[PDB]
Write a protein that binds this ligand. Structure first.
Ligand SMILES: C[S@@+](CC[C@H](N)C(=O)[O-])C[C@H]1O[C@@H](n2cnc3c(N)ncnc32)[C@H](O)[C@@H]1O
Ligand SMILES: C[S@@+](CC[C@H](N)C(=O)[O-])C[C@H]1O[C@@H](n2cnc3c(N)ncnc32)[C@H](O)[C@@H]1O
Lengths: 229, 229
């Protein structure tokens, strides 16, 4: 079943707009063909009603039960100097079930906050596309940027991924925790001074084996481990 | 320090040739600056001996401590219909430590064998670049394409990643195995017909939580779990 996204409800009809109208057209949906539509935290099985140029209305047939991630993870991602890489990180974090995404400004990360705020518009659209593809009805919230220097661990388990520090193995982490905070560096990584402060604050430094990975690969590695164990 | 790749040694000198010389010059190495050079399974610390027009000789001054992957993994990757995606999978599999990469032709995968063979040339270049960036001294072999119907469970643990089958959790597979065979599907996944055959042949079906991932995301997810546990 194809899945679409809506942020507009009119009675018992879910409305598709702009990009979703185009996506709907591409799928060449049949008159009585059922499809899913994500709206306000749930996936609704629907059938088509109106097919117009700037709008597709979908009749709600059945409201499905929403499956939530087994763990509540907040990813504090140092913005990559190559902004394009964030498209992948945001997409994959969404697929994996991460609940909250916080862009971080660190010593070696992208530095322009204004550009980060603008790019966030695109990142939110990427989250929506990933939600449709992964059949994830709950959004991944993208928050305003925070500076690494101001972070304070507050989750049940708090981790800093660092290839430059002889940290602990993933299995040494509290895998029974239900809430996590994970801090990941940009291409250049974390400076020794930056990471030291984070470790002193209470972030457990984790080292993935056996090699140093690119930022996006490290994100999926740690999140997949935490989400599945 | 920067790391380079060589397949030619002359006495105590490691030689960089072809495109590697261009790569070296792009890195703008300073006078007396030391750098690493991968050669036959080891990474040597070197300094420039002589720079020529199309080759650079590097004097070995020491040897870096290297580490091999803790697990021997063979990834059987159904070729994605979007061939570009394979560039990412090959690169990440290399970063993660996968030893052997085998492109597979399944019911819903890319079908042109001739095109797969052509792209393999690029995949081999990607492997070398990932080796340099991850400081991985051993290559990842990219084999000729084979059909899903011709796969055999040759490793200590043989797994098929399938979102369409209620398989077991990753933490429940044989994590004490030294060798693994991992089969991953294309964008459209595995048909019920072909997966049933693979399961009967001896492949253990694994289901990642909580949502359906894109192929590349699933690869990093399972490989990271196997390598770190
Ligand atoms: C590419 S790495 C740092 C640069 C890398 N050392 C290099 O020069 O190739 C970017 C980020 O990914 C994460 N990372 C990469 N490899 C890691 C590993 N093996 N263990 C833990 N974190 C890692 C860390 O958050 C790191 O700051
Ligand atoms: C994109 S998935 C299959 C199509 C997907 N269900 C969809 O329609 O969006 C591609 C491949 O990634 C792997 N995969 C993705 N999610 C998975 C999961 N949750 N558990 C196990 N394997 C998964 C499987 O090998 C699958 O064949």
């Amino acid at each position: 079943m194809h899945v679409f996204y809506s942020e507009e409800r009119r009675g018992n009809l879910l409305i598709l707009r702009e990009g979703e109208v185009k996506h709907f057209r591409v799928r060449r949906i049949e008159k009585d063909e059922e499809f899913g539509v994500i709206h306000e935290g749930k996936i609704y099985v629907c059938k088509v009603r109106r097919e117009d140029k700037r709008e597709i209305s979908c009749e709600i047939v059945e409201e499905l039960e929403t499956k939530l991630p087994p763990k509540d993870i907040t990813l504090y991602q140092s913005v990559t100097v190559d902004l394009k890489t964030m498209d992948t990180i945001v997409r994959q974090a969404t697929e994996l079930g991460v609940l909250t995404f916080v862009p971080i400004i660190s010593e070696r990360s992208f530095q322009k906050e204004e550009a980060i705020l603008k790019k966030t518009e695109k990142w939110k659209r990427i989250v929506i596309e990933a939600m449709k593809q992964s059949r994830r009805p709950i959004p991944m919230e993208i928050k305003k940027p925070v500076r690494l220097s101001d972070l304070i661990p507050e989750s049940e388990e708090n981790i800093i991924l660092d290839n430059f520090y002889e940290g602990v193995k993933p299995k040494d982490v509290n895998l029974e925790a239900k809430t996590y905070s994970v801090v990941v560096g940009p291409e250049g990584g974390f400076s020794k001074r930056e990471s030291q402060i984070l470790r002193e604050k209470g972030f457990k430094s984790v080292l993935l084996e056996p090699y140093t990975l690119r930022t996006e690969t490290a994100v999926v590695s740690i999140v997949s481990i935490l989400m599945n164990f």
